[PDB]
């Protein structure tokens, strides 16, 4: 049950300097990269082309190449239409793709943010502002929705091309997506004890402190933090009085361990 995300960030510093950079995710694994410096989209996995033929990929990459240049000039030209109302620096973010369900089911999305705030989406057959958006965006939306060719193209990207492509990615990337990597844990203190868990994949993990068979409810989980090799890191802390560190252990459950949990005693 996986989500495909194309994330774009564009910074326009003044009227003659900008950059656009993208990365693509399938779940929590990176499948593509496209920096401003590169003319082409880079694969970050062997299976990033999915089940597309080479001609299909070239044609699709070509469209994005046109988009990136056209996108840049359109923002610049929209800023001229609003001014002096809005002004550089401007940051635009896009989050697009689709979530994939069993059967033949999927929802596609295309959300746009302006200065860190979600203001616009593509929905149905047109662009629209969302609740909370400044009403001045109605002029840009009216201008964007005049472009019928962009509309037809985006509809086909979201309704058809995206789910197709992702169904092919899941088949081709099945082995990386279903990999199992073991967590290795270790203890430390500052009283605050700390149970470090690192190297595991996928993301779901259970980590608690234990005096024998009694889950210390004072255990605080931190955020899931990434490692460079596409595995995860997490730490569970427990607050305690000096002298009463005797008997405490850290238990870690994870799908890669196949039943035999890790238990480290202090």
């Amino acid at each position: 049950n996986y989500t495909f995300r194309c994330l774009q960030m564009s910074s326009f510093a003044n009227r003659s300097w900008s950059r656009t950079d993208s990365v693509v995710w399938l779940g929590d694994l990176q499948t593509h990269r496209w920096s401003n410096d590169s003319a082409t989209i880079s694969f970050t996995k062997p299976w990033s082309q999915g089940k597309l033929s080479n001609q299909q990929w070239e044609k699709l990459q070509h469209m994005f190449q046109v988009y990136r240049v056209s996108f840049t000039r359109d923002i610049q030209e929209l800023v001229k239409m609003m001014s002096p109302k809005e002004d550089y620096p401007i940051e635009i973010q896009l989050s697009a793709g689709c979530e994939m369900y069993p059967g033949n089911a999927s929802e596609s999305f295309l959300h746009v943010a302006f200065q860190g705030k979600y203001v616009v989406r593509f929905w149905g057959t047109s662009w629209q502002t969302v609740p909370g958006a400044p009403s001045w965006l109605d002029l840009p939306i009216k201008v964007l929705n005049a472009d019928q060719g962009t509309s037809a193209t985006v509809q086909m990207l979201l309704n058809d091309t995206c789910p197709l492509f992702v169904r092919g990615l899941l088949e081709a990337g099945k082995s990386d997506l279903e990999k199992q990597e073991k967590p290795v844990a270790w203890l430390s203190s500052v009283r605050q004890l700390v149970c470090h868990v690192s190297g595991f994949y996928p993301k779901p993990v259970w980590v608690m402190w234990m005096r024998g068979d009694q889950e210390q409810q004072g255990t605080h989980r931190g955020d899931f933090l990434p490692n460079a090799d596409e595995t995860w890191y997490l730490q569970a802390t427990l607050d305690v009085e000096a002298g009463e560190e005797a008997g405490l252990a850290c238990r870690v459950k994870h799908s890669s361990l196949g039943g035999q949990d890790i238990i480290l005693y202090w």
Epitope: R73, D74, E77, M81, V143, L144, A146, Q148, G149
Partner: T-cell receptor, first 111, second 113 residues
Amino acid sequence: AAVTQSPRNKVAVTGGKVTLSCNQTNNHNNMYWYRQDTGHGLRLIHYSYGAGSTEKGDIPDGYKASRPSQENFSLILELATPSQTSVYFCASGDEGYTQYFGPGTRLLVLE
Amino acid sequence: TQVEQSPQSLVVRQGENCVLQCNYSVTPDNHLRWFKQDTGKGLVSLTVLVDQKDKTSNGRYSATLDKDAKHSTLHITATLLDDTATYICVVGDRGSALGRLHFGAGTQLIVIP
């Protein structure tokens, strides 16, 4: 959707001030000034997205622009030169791609 | 220049057909418009083409566009003396007012009556 230009024809001396006005009653936000010289296509000088806006086009040098109102877009040649001898076209449009053209304005600039 | 027109000029006798070429490098290519311009006069739109492979007509004018090739032609059937004019090819790079128009330098047609 009609657009008018004035003057329709004009003779001027080097160093003089020439103003070419374009008027448009379609309530079009957007207006455009072009010059047509032989053996080139029309080239964009200035344009405007609304009252108070003026933007530089491809060949703005020697030309100032003025959008005092939604109706009038003016092209101001402050110090006219012979190289500004040409036929000038104005156009207007809303959010769609169509630019509706005026009938043109012939300018000769003599020494 | 991103829009090229052929021939530069041509002369035909009344009643004859002629074909006018337009080739372009503009990207992207939303639509292509053909204008007619009489000596000392305005731009009259003849037709506008918008599809990947497109065909239009307007009485004795017909036209084609192939966006893959980046090629348009304008056919004029049974020319009349009034067809004496410069014919201009224009490519608009957007489906909205965000676009720029790229103008060919025209083909001069003379019809001998």
